[PDB]
Scaffold this active site. Structure first.
Site, PDB file in Angstrom:
ATOM      1  N   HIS B  43       0.805  -1.215   0.000  1.00 56.47           N
ATOM      2  CA  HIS B  43       0.000   0.000   0.000  1.00 56.47           C
ATOM      3  C   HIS B  43       0.841   1.269   0.000  1.00 56.47           C
ATOM      4  CE1 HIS B  43      -1.933  -3.152   2.631  1.00 56.47           C
ATOM      5  NE2 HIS B  43      -2.756  -3.118   1.600  1.00 56.47           N
ATOM      6  N   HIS B  45       0.970   4.447   1.945  1.00 51.40           N
ATOM      7  CA  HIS B  45       0.560   5.041   3.205  1.00 51.40           C
ATOM      8  C   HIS B  45       0.718   6.561   3.121  1.00 51.40           C
ATOM      9  CE1 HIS B  45       0.384   1.406   6.030  1.00 51.40           C
ATOM     10  NE2 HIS B  45       0.445   0.941   4.795  1.00 51.40           N
ATOM     11  N   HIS B  60      -3.189   4.210   5.631  1.00 49.95           N
ATOM     12  CA  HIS B  60      -3.293   4.184   4.160  1.00 49.95           C
ATOM     13  C   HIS B  60      -3.699   5.542   3.586  1.00 49.95           C
ATOM     14  CE1 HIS B  60      -3.858  -0.509   3.957  1.00 49.95           C
ATOM     15  NE2 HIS B  60      -2.764  -0.136   4.596  1.00 49.95           N
ATOM     16  N   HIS B  68     -11.148   0.382   3.294  1.00 53.76           N
ATOM     17  CA  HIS B  68     -10.144  -0.400   2.587  1.00 53.76           C
ATOM     18  C   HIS B  68     -10.794  -1.400   1.613  1.00 53.76           C
ATOM     19  CE1 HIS B  68      -6.368  -2.700   2.089  1.00 53.76           C
ATOM     20  NE2 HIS B  68      -7.150  -3.762   2.143  1.00 53.76           N
ATOM     21  N   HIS B  77      -9.282   2.457  -0.645  1.00 52.03           N
ATOM     22  CA  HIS B  77      -8.418   3.604  -0.383  1.00 52.03           C
ATOM     23  C   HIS B  77      -7.631   3.875  -1.659  1.00 52.03           C
ATOM     24  CE1 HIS B  77      -8.436   2.031   4.032  1.00 52.03           C
ATOM     25  NE2 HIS B  77      -9.383   2.940   3.881  1.00 52.03           N
ATOM     26  N   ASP B  80      -4.528   1.655  -1.970  1.00 44.84           N
ATOM     27  CA  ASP B  80      -4.693   0.216  -1.897  1.00 44.84           C
ATOM     28  C   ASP B  80      -4.257  -0.406  -3.194  1.00 44.84           C
ATOM     29  OD1 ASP B  80      -5.743   0.818   0.511  1.00 44.84           O
ATOM     30  OD2 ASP B  80      -7.823   0.314   0.003  1.00 44.84           O
ATOM     31  N   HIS B 117       3.819  -5.538   3.670  1.00 45.77           N
ATOM     32  CA  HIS B 117       3.424  -6.078   4.968  1.00 45.77           C
ATOM     33  C   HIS B 117       3.846  -7.522   5.175  1.00 45.77           C
ATOM     34  CE1 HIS B 117       0.885  -2.867   6.636  1.00 45.77           C
ATOM     35  NE2 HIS B 117       0.774  -2.510   5.368  1.00 45.77           N
ATOM     36  N   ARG B 140       4.893  -4.284   9.388  1.00 49.52           N
ATOM     37  CA  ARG B 140       5.525  -3.720   8.208  1.00 49.52           C
ATOM     38  C   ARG B 140       6.943  -4.265   8.039  1.00 49.52           C
ATOM     39  NH1 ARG B 140       2.826   2.420   8.856  1.00 49.52           N
ATOM     40  NH2 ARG B 140       0.800   1.580   9.526  1.00 49.52           N
TER      41      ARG B 140
HETATM   42 CU   LIG Z   1      -0.719  -1.030   4.499  1.00 53.96          CU
HETATM   43 ZN   LIG Z   2      -6.297   0.538   2.535  1.00 52.74          ZN
END
Ligand SMILES: [Cu+2]
Ligand SMILES: [Zn+2]
Ligand SMILES: [Cu+2]
Ligand SMILES: [Zn+2]
Ligand SMILES: [Zn+2]
Ligand SMILES: [Zn+2]
Ligand SMILES: [Zn+2]
Lengths: 152, 152
Positions: B43, B45, B60, B68, B77, B80, B117, B140
């Site tokens: 993602h 962020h 995000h 999400h 998002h 995403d 992630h 993360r």
């Molecule tokens: Cu994320």
């Molecule tokens: Zn998201």
């Protein structure tokens, strides 16, 4: 609007740099440790590219193709922020207000890079061919990407 | 228009991600090594803040206050971008075109962070408390700031 840039390069050199958009000016608060005592050129270079360490950052952010100069000079690049002065303990703090750079619009420095140099920025006055180009500040000791920060 | 993000984190994990925008379509090209095999949430962020490793990247990038979702979902998002798939030897590659993110304007991802992630993004369907927030993708493994690149 807020920005931060964490800078790294040569072992021991560490730098954090906060930006805050204040009307038509940007306030810059920068701190370093691990520097050689003395003055170090300090610039926004064009690219936020670290695929080749500090080298891929490119040259001074200069959207107006003008000559290199001092922060306070008539002729300068958008990215000309002068020298950071390292004390005997190898540490430095630098605060300034700059109405050239921006955290938004065409002068935005978001996603570009900060680079601090080996030698001083002669500010365009050194009489060396590099003077009106880079300020003859030599190699790149540390650099970092300017990323969006929490705008509290 | 081009953008680059060099990603870094836990021991061994390397990653480079190139962005290329044409019209409303951003091509995201990623090459990773050192990952655990299987899917990893991936993602943009909100913050390009690395003062606290990947933690300071915030949540995000979600300028339109949506839940999400998967990259191709009805609701998602901006940031995403779904899952990266790592092979049995830890290598991963992704090549996806997205029309939500941008390198310009309100959806610009310049100077925000890319994060990968430890666990898979359940695309908002995993029925867990964090599914519609983060896709329940866990901690993360690595991140980087997305910088302006030579557009050529
Ligand atoms: Cu994320
Ligand atoms: Zn998201
Ligand atoms: Cu420079
Ligand atoms: Zn401070
Ligand atoms: Zn310059
Ligand atoms: Zn201008
Ligand atoms: Zn929109």
């Amino acid at each position: 609007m807020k920005a931060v840039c964490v800078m790294r390069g040569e072992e021991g050199v560490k730098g954090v740099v906060h930006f805050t958009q204040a009307g038509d000016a940007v306030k810059v608060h920068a701190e370093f440790e691990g520097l050689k005592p003395g003055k170090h050129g300090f610039h926004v270079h064009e690219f936020g590219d670290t695929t080749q360490g500090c080298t891929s950052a490119g040259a001074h952010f200069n959207p107006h193709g003008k000559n290199h100069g001092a922060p306070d000079a008539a002729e300068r690049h958008v990215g000309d922020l002068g020298n950071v002065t390292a004390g005997a303990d190898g540490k430095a703090t630098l605060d300034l207000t700059d109405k050239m750079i921006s955290l938004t619009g065409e002068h935005s420095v978001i996603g570009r890079s900060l680079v601090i140099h080996v030698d001083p920025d002669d500010l365009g006055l050194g009489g060396h061919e590099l003077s009106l180009i880079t300020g003859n500040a030599g190699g790149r000791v540390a650099c970092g990407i300017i990323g969006i920060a929490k705008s509290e």
